[PDB]
Structures are given as structure tokens and as C-alpha cells.
């Protein structure tokens, strides 16, 4: 219940990473009901975004940083389920449901 101490090693940290991913995935049906996503996105797409998020941070080697990321993820998930801030194609911070990029940026504005 209380905030646990900082992880000793990457095995402890990974056990915690797996525990969080399990909790995040198990709440997916609750989210789908709250935001009425039955005709917007698939539950696996929600799972992919969560596992993606975790895979983008696979280069972290410091267990303290991993603990902070897990804590922030747990906080973010709790808000999404309890205090939903509904936006159409957006759940929290996740978008749900012949020329190079330079010329597009050039056409848009002078600030890239």
C-alpha cells in the first residue's frame, strides 16, 4: 500500500514493471466502458500502446528511474479509471482510434 523503497536491482525493477503492466492491462475493460470505445478502438490496441510505452523505455539502466516511471504510470492509470477526462480520440495522453517533411514544415511556418 505504502510507497515501497527504491528497487535494489533490475530483477526487482522488472518484477515491478511486469506487475504494473499486468494492472494496466487488467483495467482495459473498465476504460472501454467508461469512454465508450466499443466502436472506436480494439482492446489489443490499448494493450499495444501500453507495451509500446514500456518498450520505448527499454534503454534505462538505473532502477531508481524505473521506479519513478512505474509510479508515474500508476498515478496516470488511476486518474484515467477514477477521474476520467473524456475527449473524443484522446484517453489521457494517448491518441485513441511525395514531398519530404521539410517542404511541409516550410509551407506551414518559419518555426520548425
Amino acid at each position: 500500500i505504502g510507497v515501497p523503497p527504491n528497487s535494489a536491482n533490475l530483477t526487482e525493477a522488472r518484477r515491478r514493471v511486469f506487475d504494473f503492466f499486468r494492472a494496466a492491462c487488467r483495467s482495459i475493460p473498465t476504460i472501454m466502458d467508461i469512454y465508450n470505445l466499443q466502436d472506436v478502438v480494439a482492446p489489443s490496441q490499448l494493450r499495444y500502446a501500453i507495451s509500446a510505452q514500456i518498450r520505448n523505455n527499454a534503454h534505462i539502466t538505473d532502477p531508481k528511474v524505473i521506479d519513478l516511471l512505474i509510479f508515474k504510470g500508476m498515478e496516470e492509470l488511476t486518474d484515467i479509471v477514477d477521474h476520467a477526462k473524456q475527449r473524443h480520440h484522446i484517453i489521457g495522453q494517448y491518441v485513441v482510434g511525395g514531398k519530404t517533411d521539410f517542404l511541409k514544415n516550410f509551407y506551414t511556418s518559419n518555426y520548425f
Binding site: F102, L103, F106
Partner: protein, 687 residues
């Protein structure tokens, strides 16, 4: 302890140093330093008004008084030399009482003007009253009053505020070299003025605004417009000439409010010219905001970027490669010139050059177009020979360094060129290449003066570069340089003075005009900010595209207008006349639909079908590293490595045509200054 302001102290020899005590603490200073300078090395800030490091000592304000042991009176530290074993006290009751008494006398007749005074909020008198003299005022009598004086359209005058420090008078005589300001009368009734009604005409006149510690001399175009606490400060460089004076740009929102000098001991030493100081008001007038193409009726209509680039891209493919010509403007950054050169070369053309006299010179060796003595190195020269150059209107801060050297070291100045008004002693040797022929052959008092010179300096203006006999003249000068041992491993006295901010980087990048007549045979002319090129030399059926932020004539002729950002809105690379590379810092947003110059040429190239290997300014600087790597090593002082010996011998004949003036109007030299109210008023009354 860190010296005040982080100031550096140079020691000619450790043996030539003395020990003094500043508030008990022990400091070591060179022999000849004053008590005030010793206090700065100790890190103690002494209050001052009449003392300026770059002016002669006056010792009249009496605000720098400190206590010296065994001295019966308080000592003016600004004038008193430091002596070994001297014990200097600055916070004693004697020193504090002296400061309060002097500050009382200073405010006795000072007007209650802080609310209407532009110095308010950045005033040494305000700050020192709050700090040193915390006297409840007890002066109840009538204040004196003074009438205001007229000094022209740049310097507004409220002379009731003057504290008679004479900084302005000393600056006029010693730095500007124009003796117009004096102190008239005697006693409390003495007044700073010109006595007879005359305006301040020196091109360095605006610097009296910075040195006046009170609001007696202020900028008239900046009058009442802003308070210093609401201005964002940006440290950048000036592009009005080829000197690269360091400046601070003050802005409030999307608007430049004023330009004031920045300290750079190697270039401008906290001074700037009046063109640098007062050209800012042109940055918000007659700005090209949108891409325009001329209509059926021959009238410009605004369009989007996509339609404008499509038109230029389509029509560029309907001409032969040799008929494409690119001209870079005098305010072009190194990045945009590199992208322009790549774009034109990748279209099969070799007609890229920078506008101005140095359009088609030999850029093989870097000594041949740079001031090799360096600006700071001019102070060591004991003789100056100027050929085809008026530094006063061409490079004002370079001319300032010459005057300072002539005044201090008593250097001699020989001048060969059209008649001119110099602010220092200068013999007029002649007007054209005949005098060079006489100087080469000797039998002249200046020739034996040039021989008897330990460290002579020759300065040759870039204006002579556009002459038919440029190689004959260059060979004649390089022969004079050898005959008098001007170039040695300990003294490189051969100098070439550039006029345009873009000229040095253009020559480094290889933007050299190969065909001298490629402009009259061109059908696609790309004028990247080149407003000073003669546009009636272009064929009437040629497709001209003008890209810049201002313009008067090339805008009229152009078939397409591409709005570009100015130097205050972008991070661009510029190299000065001595080879020193610097970069501008963005201070304000860009107006309308404008874009950076390198972005426009890269965007056009993509539309035109050429793929340049870069998409960002970092990839452009990587490209530059392959051409002119000095322009990517910014703020690095590097000596030359090759000299005039490698130059193949020339046998061309000389043209009897006398040297022509390059700068006809000091205030009207670029498109920014041509769009400026103040510069127009300066041309009207200050010329």
C-alpha cells in the same frame, strides 16, 4: 578574488609588478595602475562618474574618494597611481562620509526629473544615491536651471541634468576626433555646449548617449518610448558593414526598440557607429511580408508559398544552364550563400557572386582579402598608408582604431585616393595609381618614412577590386609590401578592407564571378537580397526573382518576390574584415509570411527538382565544413598560413583612372537603412 566584471589583467613581466593592500586583502597589479584599478583587481566596486576607462582621467567629480594610509586628505582613486605597500581603505567612516558629502552636492541642483527622464531605472546617479549617500535631503534653496541645446536629430538634450563630468567633451576630442563639444563659462554657471549653433556631425556621435551618466544626452529617436526594465536584451552582431561590431538589441514584444554597443575589446570597444545605432527603425518599414507574383496587368498580387515556388521552379527549367545567374546580397549569412551556391551549381551554372566591388577577385589565398594585422593589432603600427580607402565611411570602427593609434602612439598616415575629410592628421600623397608608381620607385619623404617604419601598415580598400587594373595595382601594392618588409613572421602589415558584412564569407565559400558579363546574357536572375546591383543591366525579357526583406529597384523589376527574414530575426553566420567569424542571435519574430534565406533556396531547389543533402541548418554547416571550415569554428582567432610569395607574377599595365569613392552616403548603404526615417533625417541635416 575575481577582478571586477571578470576583467583580465596582463603582465608584461612578473618582475614589473607591485603589491598594494585593498581593505587588508593583498593584490598584485602591474606598475602604473591607479588606486581605482587596484581596487577593481581586488574585486571592490568604487563609485565613479567622471572616470571612463577608455577616456583620459579627469578627476573632477570627486566620487571615487578613498582613504589612503598616511595620506592627510581623501584620495581620488581614479587619478592616484598605486604604490608598493599602499594601504587602501574604501569603507571607512572617512570614505563613506566623503561619498555622502559629494552625493549631496551632486543632487543639490539636479532637477526632480526621474519620472520624465529616460535614464530612470538605469541611472548611476539613482543607484549611487540609494547605496552611498543615504542622506535625507536638506537643500531648501532655489535650484539653478539651464536652457536646452540643439545638437541635431540624434542627441536630445536636457542640460539641467548635466553634472559637468566632461565625459562628452573628452570623448569628442579623443575618440570621435571632432572637436565640437566644449565646456563654456566658469563656476556653477558653466555649460556644456558648442557655443555657436552647430549639430554633432561625427559618425560616432551617438556614443555620447552611452557615456553620459545622467539623462542630459539621450537618444532623440528613442525618447520616452520605453523603460529599461521592460526591454528584452539580445546579444548579437551588426551587419551594417564588414566590421561585425558587437551589439545589444533591446526589444519589447515583436519590436526592436534600440541598439546599444556590446563590449568586444578586439573589434569595437563598447563603441558603435551612428548607422549601427539608429538603423533599427527601418526594420519595421516597407517589409516584404508575402510572396508576390506580377499579374496580367503587371501588378503584384500576393500568393501562397506553394504557388510562388511552383512558378519559379517551372520557369527555371526553360532556360539554358549558363543563362542562370545568382547574386548574393550584402547582408547574406554564410548558410544562405552556401545553399545558393549549391543550388545554382546543381543547375549547371557557375554564375554566383556577392554583390559589390569584390565580385570577381582571386579568392585563392585568404590573406589577399582580409585585414591581416587584425583590428586590435593596428594599435601597434607606427605608420599607416591608405590606398583607395576612406575607413571613416567604409569601416567606422576601424577608422576609430586608427585615430586612437595616431593620437596615442603618434603614428603617421599617408592617403592615396580622392579627397576626403579625415578626423586625424593625414598627408595627401596623391589620388590614383601614379602615386603608387611613385611610392614603388621611392624618392619621396613618405617613402623614406615608410622605410624608417618599424611596424608599418598598408590598408587597401575593397573598392579597388572592381577596377580593370586591379591585378596591376595589387601587384604594385604587394611589391611595395615586400620592398619595405611590411610582411614578416612577427608583423603582418598587409591589409585589405572589406565593405560588406557578407563579403568575407562569400570569398571563403568561393562565390566568385567567373564571367564578367554573365548578367547581360542571363534569363533567370536570382537576387538573394542583392538590392545594390544595377538592375537595368538585366535583359528586359529575363525572369528576375527578388528574395529579401526590403527593396526599392530590384523589387520593381522582379517577376516574383520571396519575403525573407532580417538579421535580428535569425541565427546567421557572418565573417568580418579581419577573418573573425560570428553568428547573429534571433531577437524578435519574423514579420508576415517571411522565411529564412537558406530555407527559401532549399525549398526552391526541392521544387525545381534538385535534392540538396541537408534539411536543417546543422546539415548546412556540415556542408560548409567541406568548403570553408573556418566559418564553422565561430569566435576563433587564427593567423594566416600563406602569403604573397605564392602569387603568380603579373605584368599588366596600369589605368590612369583615379580611385573612386565607394560610399557616397554613409547613412544610405543597405536596404535596411534606406527604409529608415532617422537615416533619412541624418542624410538631410548631418551630411
Amino acid at each position: 578574488r575575481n577582478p571586477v566584471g571578470g576583467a583580465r589583467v596582463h603582465f608584461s613581466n612578473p618582475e614589473d609588478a607591485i603589491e598594494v593592500f585593498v581593505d587588508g586583502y593583498a593584490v598584485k597589479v602591474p606598475k602604473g595602475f591607479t588606486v581605482l584599478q587596484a581596487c577593481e583587481v581586488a574585486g571592490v566596486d568604487i563609485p565613479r562618474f567622471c572616470y571612463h576607462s577608455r577616456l583620459s582621467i579627469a578627476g573632477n567629480c570627486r566620487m571615487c574618494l578613498v582613504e589612503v594610509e598616511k595620506s592627510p586628505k581623501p584620495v581620488a582613486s581614479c587619478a592616484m597611481p598605486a604604490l608598493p605597500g599602499m594601504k587602501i581603505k574604501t569603507d571607512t567612516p572617512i570614505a563613506k562620509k566623503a561619498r555622502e558629502g559629494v552625493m549631496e552636492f551632486l543632487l543639490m541642483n539636479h532637477p526632480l526629473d526621474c519620472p520624465i527622464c529616460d535614464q530612470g531605472g538605469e541611472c548611476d546617479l539613482q543607484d549611487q544615491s540609494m547605496a552611498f549617500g543615504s542622506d535625507r535631503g536638506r537643500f531648501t534653496e532655489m535650484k539653478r536651471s539651464v536652457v536646452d541645446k540643439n545638437l541635431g536629430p540624434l542627441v536630445k538634450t536636457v542640460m539641467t541634468r548635466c553634472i559637468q563630468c566632461t565625459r562628452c567633451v573628452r570623448f569628442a576630442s579623443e575618440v570621435a576626433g571632432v572637436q565640437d563639444l566644449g565646456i563654456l563659462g566658469r563656476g556653477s554657471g558653466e555649460e556644456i555646449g558648442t557655443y555657436v549653433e552647430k549639430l554633432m556631425t561625427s559618425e560616432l556621435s551617438g556614443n555620447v548617449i552611452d557615456i553620459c551618466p545622467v539623462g542630459a544626452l539621450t537618444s532623440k529617436p528613442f525618447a520616452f518610448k520605453a523603460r529599461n526594465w521592460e526591454l528584452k536584451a539580445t546579444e548579437t552582431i551588426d551587419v551594417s558593414d564588414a566590421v561585425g561590431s558587437n551589439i545589444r538589441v533591446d526589444s519589447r514584444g515583436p519590436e526592436v526598440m534600440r541598439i546599444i554597443p556590446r563590449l568586444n575589446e578586439d573589434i569595437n570597444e563598447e563603441w558603435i557607429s551612428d548607422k549601427t545605432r539608429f538603423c533599427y527603425d527601418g526594420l519595421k518599414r516597407q517589409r516584404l511580408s508575402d510572396p508576390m507574383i506580377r499579374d496580367s496587368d503587371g501588378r503584384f498580387k500576393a500568393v501562397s508559398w506553394r504557388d510562388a515556388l511552383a512558378v519559379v521552379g517551372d520557369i527555371i527549367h526553360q532556360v539554358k544552364p549558363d543563362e542562370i545567374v545568382g547574386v548574393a546580397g550584402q547582408l547574406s549569412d554564410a548558410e544562405s550563400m552556401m545553399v545558393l551556391k549549391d543550388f545554382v551549381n546543381r543547375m549547371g551554372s557557375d554564375n554566383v557572386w556577392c554583390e559589390g566591388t569584390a565580385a570577381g577577385v582571386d579568392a585563392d589565398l585568404r590573406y589577399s582579402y582580409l585585414m591581416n594585422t587584425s583590428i586590435s593589432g593596428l594599435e601597434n603600427a607606427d605608420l599607416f598608408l591608405l590606398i583607395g580607402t576612406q575607413p571613416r565611411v567604409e569601416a567606422a570602427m576601424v577608422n576609430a582604431r586608427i585615430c586612437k593609434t595616431v593620437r596615442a602612439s603618434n603614428a603617421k598616415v599617408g592617403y592615396v585616393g580622392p579627397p576626403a575629410e579625415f578626423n586625424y592628421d593625414c598627408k595627401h600623397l596623391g589620388t590614383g595609381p601614379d602615386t603608387l608608381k611613385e611610392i614603388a620607385e621611392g624618392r619621396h619623404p613618405f617613402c623614406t618614412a615608410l622605410k624608417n617604419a618599424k611596424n608599418p601598415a598598408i590598408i587597401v580598400g575593397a573598392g579597388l577590386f572592381n577596377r580593370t587594373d586591379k591585378n596591376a595595382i595589387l601587384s604594385s601594392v604587394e611589391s611595395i609590401a615586400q620592398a619595405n618588409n611590411v610582411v614578416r613572421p612577427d608583423w603582418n602589415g598587409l591589409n585589405f578592407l572589406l565593405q560588406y558584412a557578407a563579403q568575407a564569407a562569400a570569398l571563403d565559400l568561393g562565390l566568385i564571378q567567373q564571367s564578367a558579363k554573365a548578367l547581360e546574357s542571363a534569363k533567370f536572375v536570382y537576387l538573394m537580397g542583392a538590392d545594390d546591383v544595377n538592375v537595368d543591366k538585366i535583359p528586359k525579357d529575363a525572369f528576375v526573382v527578388y528574395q529579401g526583406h526590403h527593396g526599392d529597384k530590384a523589387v520593381y523589376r522582379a517577376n516574383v518576390i520571396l519575403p525573407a527574414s532580417a538579421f535580428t530575426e535569425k541565427e546567421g553566420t557572418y565573417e568580418n574584415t579581419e577573418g573573425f567569424t560570428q553568428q547573429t542571435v534571433p531577437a524578435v519574430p519574423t514579420v508576415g509570411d517571411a522565411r529564412d534565406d537558406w530555407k527559401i533556396v532549399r525549398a526552391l531547389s526541392e521544387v525545381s527538382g534538385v535534392k540538396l543533402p541537408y534539411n536543417s541548418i546543422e546539415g548546412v554547416r556540415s556542408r560548409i565544413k567541406s568548403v570553408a571550415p573556418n566559418l564553422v569554428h565561430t569566435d576563433e582567432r587564427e593567423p594566416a598560413a600563406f602569403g604573397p610569395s605564392l602569387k603568380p607574377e603579373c605584368k599588366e599595365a596600369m589605368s590612369t583612372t583615379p580611385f573612386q569613392t565607394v560610399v557616397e552616403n554613409f547613412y544610405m548603404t543597405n536596404s535596411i537603412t534606406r527604409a529608415s526615417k532617422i537615416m533619412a533625417q541624418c542624410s538631410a541635416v548631418l551630411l
